[PDB]
């Protein structure tokens, strides 16, 4: 397969000095954690933890202490960066309730003051559909007044409604596939529909960076799971060759099926999947394709049909097209699209179709209005402006950050910008300093990522204007000067 347009991505390497200092910091933290555990065990220092009731003291201990090591010794120190409560619509500006801790993040108390007008770079609204006032909100209010909030039964039983059928046909038209089915949770979509498609005796090939839902869905089904490297089509090709040739491990028989699980945009890495080469490989080796499009269904594409439109490919090549309405459309949910036979088989044999409650009516109304706005059935020019503004903001932000000397991951087109910090203390420092300057960001640490690579992710939006981006960029420059976060050799 070939690319009609250039495919630009950069993953700079960690400078050796920074790696050495990273390991120094982690070693110091480990040693002081062991000391703190020794102090707490001998009751020399009182432990601020809940303990089991006296009636159950002779039972086997519920948890293993070593498993909680990183939680007490390292996570607790910088716990204030996460779980920040908000009290406003998560737009371009958000209101964060303030909290203070006097026992080093072990317990939090909410002061009266609330921070207002924080620039929001943690929420997932790519097209800026999270508004408390709009046409979508009015339609949702009307359907809430009519249908009520929530349904009390299952789809196969009396719980199926007409709104759900309307949403399913609208989604099928939107993606370009023949049929689609909607679910009430994006995580449940994968976790409950990967087991139905594939069972024991089949092979599943997973990327290194698959979401937890895809991995859980693969585990629940009995299929063998083999992991190829991130966007390495040499690894995928070699795994396909060996799987077809050698067969099953215990008794070398042909695999019943081979399923390849991939994603459109990887949120943390920032990269976009090399879809043309994956499609070429699956056609050559007769393997099926499962494409998760949670992050790319609204952000990518000239009009917004996803990665398949972005590359210009054919939707009929992708066997299963998963997706989530939470990120772009601004309402919770999930969907799978494909052939009519596949959709009917899922309608009969999906776990959530049989046992789990169907989606709330106001949510499907909000999804319908948002999707009609995106494809332009209403006739308003809001559909094109949001996508164009998202693309412009992405390019401007990424370019001007790269020209300040930072290290950034991923393609030039992806609207997620992971900046790299590389040091455990700089995670907490960056989070606190950015909040102090009215900017909200998301930071991740060692158990989540590779040990050397610790990052802060920015999620751009069509709601961010040039003024907001310029303010954020000047604040980021000031912080990077303060914390010395410009590790880029190519640029200064």
């Amino acid at each position: 397969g070939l690319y009609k347009r250039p495919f630009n991505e950069a993953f700079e390497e960690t400078p050796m000095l920074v790696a050495v200092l990273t390991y120094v910091g982690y070693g110091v933290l480990t040693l002081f954690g062991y000391l703190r555990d020794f102090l707490r065990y001998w009751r020399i220092e009182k432990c601020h933890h809940a303990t089991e009731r006296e009636e159950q003291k002779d039972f086997v201990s519920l948890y293993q202490d070593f498993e909680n090591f990183y939680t007490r010794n390292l996570y607790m120190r910088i716990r204030d960066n996460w779980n920040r409560p908000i009290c406003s619509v998560p737009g371009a500006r958000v209101d964060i309730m303030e909290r203070q801790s006097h026992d080093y993040n072990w317990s939090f108390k909410y002061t009266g003051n609330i921070i207002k007008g924080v620039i929001n770079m943690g929420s997932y609204n790519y097209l800026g559909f999270a508004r408390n006032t709009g046409s979508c909100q009015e339609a949702a209010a009307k359907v809430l007044e009519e249908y009520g909030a929530g349904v009390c039964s299952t789809r196969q039983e009396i719980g199926n409604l007409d709104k759900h059928e309307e949403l399913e046909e609208l989604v099928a038209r939107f993606l370009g596939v023949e049929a689609a089915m909607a679910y009430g949770m994006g995580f449940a979509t994968n976790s409950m529909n990967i087991p139905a498609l594939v069972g024991k005796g089949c092979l599943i090939l997973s990327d290194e960076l698959n979401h937890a839902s895809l991995v859980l869905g693969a585990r629940l089904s009995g299929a063998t799971i083999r992991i190829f490297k991130h966007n390495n089509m040499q690894s995928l090709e070699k795994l396909l060759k060996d799987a077809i040739v050698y067969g099953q491990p215990r008794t070398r028989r042909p695999w019943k099926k081979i399923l390849i699980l991939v994603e459109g945009i990887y949120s943390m890495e920032g990269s976009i999947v090399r879809l043309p080469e994956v499609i070429a490989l699956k056609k050559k080796y007769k393997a099926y394709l499962y494409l998760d499009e949670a992050h790319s269904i609204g952000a990518l594409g000239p009009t917004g049909r996803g990665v398949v439109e972005y590359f210009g490919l054919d939707p009929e090549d992708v066997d299963v097209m998963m997706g989530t309405f939470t990120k772009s459309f601004g309402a919770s949910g999930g969907y799978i699209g494909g052939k009519k036979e596949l959709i009917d088989y899922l309608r009969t044999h999906s776990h959530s179709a049989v046992y789990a409650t169907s989606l709330s009516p106001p949510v499907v109304e909000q999804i319908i209005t948002s999707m009609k706005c995106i494809m332009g059935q209403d006739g308003t020019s809001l559909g094109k402006e949001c996508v164009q503004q998202l693309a412009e903001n992405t390019r401007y932000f990424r370019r001007r950050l790269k020209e300040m000397g930072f290290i950034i991951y991923g393609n030039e087109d992806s609207p997620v910008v992971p900046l790299m910090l590389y040091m455990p203390a700089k995670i907490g420092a960056f989070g606190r300093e950015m909040l102090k300057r009215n900017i909200g960001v998301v930071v991740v640490g060692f158990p989540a990522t590779p040990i050397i690579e610790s990052r802060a992710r920015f999620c751009l939006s069509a709601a961010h204007t040039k003024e907001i981006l310029d303010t954020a960029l000047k604040e980021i420059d000031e912080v990077g000067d303060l914390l010395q976060l410009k590790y880029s050799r190519h640029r200064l």
Partner: protein, 420 residues
């Protein structure tokens, strides 16, 4: 290289989805032309709702709709992120506090999906090497939770404590064989307050005694009993009077009684605080939309304001269960206290498909007669213990006495005509 090549060439994969016969009843979906409520319209036929898990009739309450509308105007529809990353609203914390105060417990955690609640709660505590004693008639959510965990699963007969004691005693023998492993193995007992498949209640006092005797923790599922049982409707613990502190973890969903999407787990801080970091459905998924949380809070306020609705529901369940007794070919399975019970075929013929067809004939003829019934749906190849096919009868405080008598009568004539 060439032998590798046509080894690649000769292989042929099985089709992704098996060819589906059109005879599947689950293929055809009932289409409800409006909200599923009292006096609903199904398939274009006006009917009285006897299939929706709406026990208290809070789905259509103007107070709930007003609260949901106010919260929708304040926040919108979407939360746009997990609870870790700017997805926590003040309504979520308020709802968790309200649930903790309502159930008289230290802490509660809310998930955005009823299935994920227990399917994520169970694997968080039960790991590989542990021992889980789970009832045979356990819903599919519990089964998927136990499969996600890799612990050893031991099944015992439904509501039978002799089999539980037998398994516990064999475990004590294996304990005596090797103490070193015995000191690091944890034992759990997963039960349900009011079983959905069979409509039968569980023996809590015996379970608590066995817990304290054999050092095994207890996990309880209260999906159906959360809003129907007890003087204040706090579950089966209030029904039996058992102290809630004996039960380690109590999980339920907000869909049935509270009539909004979501689910929750309640317990002491010691057990609950682990799920905030190890519950997969919690860590890696978006939070509950604010309007649903506000609807749940308003439903809790209504439930706390007056406690007589539970008594009304209890008396209606008693009346309908007494009335349905005496059908020729159909037997009632369940208890008088249960709101949702079953009607099964007394004489079971060899084929399950034809049993399903007979029950479908009964259901269709009832629907033509303005009684909207349903049939319990299962995944035949997936369930560990597949229950018999049955017609589900559900009772709601809204249904008047005369409507209950007409429903029982109509089911009676339809069943007698069909079985004849």
């Amino acid at each position: 290289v060439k032998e590798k090549e046509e080894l690649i060439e000769e292989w042929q994969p099985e089709p992704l989805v098996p060819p589906v016969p059109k005879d599947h009843p689950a293929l055809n979906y009932n289409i409800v032309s409006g909200p599923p409520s009292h006096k609903t319209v199904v398939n274009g036929k006006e009917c009285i709702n006897f299939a929706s898990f709406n026990f208290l009739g809070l789905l259509d309450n103007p107070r709930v709709k007003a609260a949901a509308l106010a919260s929708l105007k304040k926040y919108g529809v979407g939360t746009c992120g997990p609870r870790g990353f700017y997805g926590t609203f003040d309504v979520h914390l308020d709802l968790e506090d309200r649930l903790a105060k309502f159930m008289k417990t230290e802490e509660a955690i809310i998930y955005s999906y009823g299935f994920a609640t227990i399917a994520s709660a169970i694997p968080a505590y039960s790991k590989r090497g542990d021992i889980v004693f789970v009832d045979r008639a356990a819903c599919f959510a519990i089964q998927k939770g136990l499969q996600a965990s890799r612990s050893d699963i031991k099944l015992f007969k439904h509501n039978d404590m002799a089999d539980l004691e037998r398994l516990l005693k064999e475990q004590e023998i294996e304990d005596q064989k090797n103490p070193r492993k015995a000191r690091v193995t944890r034992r759990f007992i997963v039960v349900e307050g009011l079983y959905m498949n069979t409509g039968t209640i569980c023996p809590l006092p015996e379970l608590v005694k066995l817990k304290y005797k054999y050092k095994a923790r207890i996990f309880l599922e209260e999906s159906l009993s959360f809003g129907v049982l007890g003087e204040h409707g706090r579950g089966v613990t209030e029904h039996y009077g058992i102290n809630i502190d004996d039960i380690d973890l109590i999980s339920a969903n907000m869909e049935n009684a509270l009539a909004s999407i979501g689910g929750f787990c309640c317990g002491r801080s010691f057990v609950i605080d682990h799920q905030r970091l190890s519950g997969q459905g919690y860590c890696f998924s978006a939070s509950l939309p604010p309007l649903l949380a506000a609807a749940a809070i308003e439903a809790l306020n209504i439930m706390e304001e007056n406690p007589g609705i539970f008594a009304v529901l209890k008396e209606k369940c008693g009346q309908i269960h007494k009335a349905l007794q005496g059908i020729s070919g159909l037997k009632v399975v369940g208890e008088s206290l249960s709101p949702a019970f079953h009607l099964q075929l007394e004489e079971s013929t060899g084929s399950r498909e034809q049993d399903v067809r007979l029950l479908q004939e009964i259901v269709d003829q009832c629907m033509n007669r303005s009684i909207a019934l349903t049939q319990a749906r299962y995944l035949e190849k997936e369930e560990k213990c597949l229950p018999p096919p049955s017609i589900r009868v559900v009772v709601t405080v809204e249904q008047t006495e005369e409507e209950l008598e007409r429903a029982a009568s109509t089911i009676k004539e339809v069943a007698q005509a069909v079985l004849l």
